[PDB]
């Protein structure tokens, strides 16, 4: 096809050329800028009804989202929908502005189709992002109505003594502008998690009904069996709306070839894929298939997307694949997912959710 040819040109020539000419943070910064200005093709992949998912109190036109980290400050939301993402997650956004870690803090492992990052939650802050989303609030209301929801990932400041209050601040400021909110959880213990999430949910429940977002918990793949058992219990107990599975890994799987493999940070991309899919599988089973999962980590194809869906994910996200494949990856994943769904006898995405477990 014309799509596969375009996909090959970006993957084989354009992206390796551009990534050779730019440091990885400049590449990211330019990507946000080009996307913010809408410098993209119109829309050759019109989304099939097969790709539609209804979850988290919302229509999703397709299940392929852009993961948190690409658009930390909500600068490129409209361009991301133009790129063909069925939903956009912005952030992480911290309460106060902060610079994050010293540069260099992003590293490419092209031999592994992986990235390492240690951004350290660089953020323009809730106030800047609030006013930025307010400027396009009604445009977003229509987009959400048309099946294109907006998520916001809420972080905390580096020097914060009270993590729960930073997240609470985020619920109050950005919850009215979001379809869903995300709080990242690291390794717990169980009572501390219950306390934090209770406060987050209380703050969410205090917003007016019309501006009341879903609340999701995002987990790393590096948790113990007991951490995962505890998270599942608390999430079911409190009525947490969903799980995002997973963040980057602090592990370094055997077989990484990139020179920069020993850089401190979170590893993303292909080496994360099956660690992430197995975490989805575990969390789906520990929650009895009753907590919607957003599957993320190493999605670069329809097969990768479908494996996460069959393992228990209602929706997927990607980021790292975009750095190697460019904008055509979104259409690629969607086309390939649709084809595989047909090949496996599923009417749509919804039928495939948790199919491995049945
Ligand atoms: C992890 C940090 N990180 C890295 C490094 O690891 N790369 N990266 C990305 N870089 C991108 O392009 C650069 C090479 C750019 F300099 F060209 F901006 C894009 C991207 O989509 N670029 C675009 C757009 C938007 C429109 N039109 C295009 O071509 C006609 C292209 Cl190539 C997406 C990314 F996630 C990124 O976030
Ligand atoms: C450069 C970079 C920055 C990221 N920043 C964030 C962030 O601020 N908050 C967050 O929850 N996840 C962040 N992530 C994690 C991604 O959202 C995603 O969970 C992870 O990269 C796995 O997906 P992928 O393999 O498709 O990239 C970041 C990832 C990368 C590569
Ligand atoms: O900002 C970061 O460093 C960051 C946040 C996060 O949640 N995940 C990640 O890989 N990096």
From Swiss-Prot:
Question: Keywords for this entry?
Answer: Disease variant, Flavoprotein, FMN, Membrane, Mitochondrion, Mitochondrion inner membrane, Oxidoreductase, Pyrimidine biosynthesis, Transit peptide, Transmembrane, Transmembrane helix
The entry's localization annotation reads:
Mitochondrion inner membrane
The keyword Nucleus belongs to this UniProt entry's keyword annotation = no
Q: Which branch of life, at top level?
A: Eukaryota
PTM comment, free text: The uncleaved transit peptide is required for mitochondrial targeting and proper membrane integration.
The UniProt record gives the binding positions of substrate as: 72, 117-121, 184-188, 247-248
Sequence positions that bind FMN = 68-72, 92, 153, 184, 218, 246, 269, 298, 319-320
- What GO molecular-function term can you cite, just one? dihydroorotate dehydrogenase activity
Q: How does it sit in the membrane?
A: Single-pass membrane protein
The positions flagged as active site in the entry are 187
Q: Which residues lie on this side of the membrane: Mitochondrial intermembrane?
A: 4-358
Pathway, per record? Pyrimidine metabolism; UMP biosynthesis via de novo pathway; orotate from (S)-dihydroorotate (quinone route): step 1/1
Q: Which cofactor does it need?
A: FMN
SUBUNIT field: Monomer.
Biological function? Catalyzes the conversion of dihydroorotate to orotate with quinone as electron acceptor. Required for UMP biosynthesis via de novo pathway.
Q: What is this protein called?
A: Dihydroorotate dehydrogenase (quinone), mitochondrial
**Source organism:** Homo sapiens
